[PDB]
Nucleic acid binder design. Structure first.
Length: 215
RNA sequence: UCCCCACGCGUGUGGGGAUG
């Protein structure tokens, strides 16, 4: 019960306009990153996930990219990013294992009244959403004295211009992006692996949903 | 929360959102 996927670390170059474009617009980032696994996506063998990492200093922006298939970063423009070699990742997941995690996700609900997806409003609801999704996904958010072992380090409403070739009007993608960090435990290694590989919650094409775990 | 899909228990649930 090991599992496999590929992780790539990209260190983006603020001097590059293409990098700045993608850092500011998760949908454009989606378009850039997709090229690295273009044929796998078309063959229906791929689920690309990524996260723009929180910066804690003046360091350059770091983007973590997970793919099910081996990525080809030769597609990146010269100067766009420094690319660390994609590396096969075999997550160690066994029942009861405690792990630190980071997840930028879209805690949302589809309103009965409007049929539309909207953001859950309060921190309590965002945390409950995470607890629910983690448990359904074979993990479990740790609960220590002082509450759930999670912190919400960022909570922002994204309004992102979206445009595909052949489309006359460019739509506006609007999604709430919540950055969670904390501690969880593995419950069911197989379901937990599927959750790492498939991602958690909406907006996966927009740099949300990548559950990253580590001892 | 702008669009699309799946659905028989949820604040409706889940999935999708390149070919510049």
């Amino acid at each position: 019960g090991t599992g496999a996927m590929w992780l790539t670390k990209l260190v983006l170059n603020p001097a590059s306009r293409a990098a700045r474009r993608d850092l500011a617009n998760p949908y454009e980032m989606h378009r850039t990153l997709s090229k690295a696994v273009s044929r796998a996506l078309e063959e229906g063998r791929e689920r690309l996930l990524w996260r723009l990492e929180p910066a804690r200093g003046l360091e350059p922006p770091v983007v973590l990219v997970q793919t099910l298939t081996e990525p080809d970063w030769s597609v990146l423009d010269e100067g766009y990013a420094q690319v660390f070699p994609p590396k096969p990742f075999h997550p160690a997941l066994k029942p009861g294992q405690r792990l630190r995690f980071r997840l930028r996700a879209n805690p949302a609900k589809r309103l009965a009244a409007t049929g539309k997806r909207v953001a859950l409003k309060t921190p309590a609801e965002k945390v409950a959403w995470l607890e629910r999704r983690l448990e359904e996904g074979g993990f479990r958010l740790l609960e220590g004295e002082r509450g759930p072992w999670v912190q919400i380090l960022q909570d922002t409403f994204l309004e992102v211009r979206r445009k595909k070739d052949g489309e006359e009007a460019g739509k506006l993608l609007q999604v709430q992006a919540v950055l969670f960090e904390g501690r969880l435990e593995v419950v069911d290694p197989e379901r937990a692996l599927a959750t790492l590989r498939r991602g958690v919650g909406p907006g996966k094409a927009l740099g949300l949903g990548l559950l990253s775990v580590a001892p």
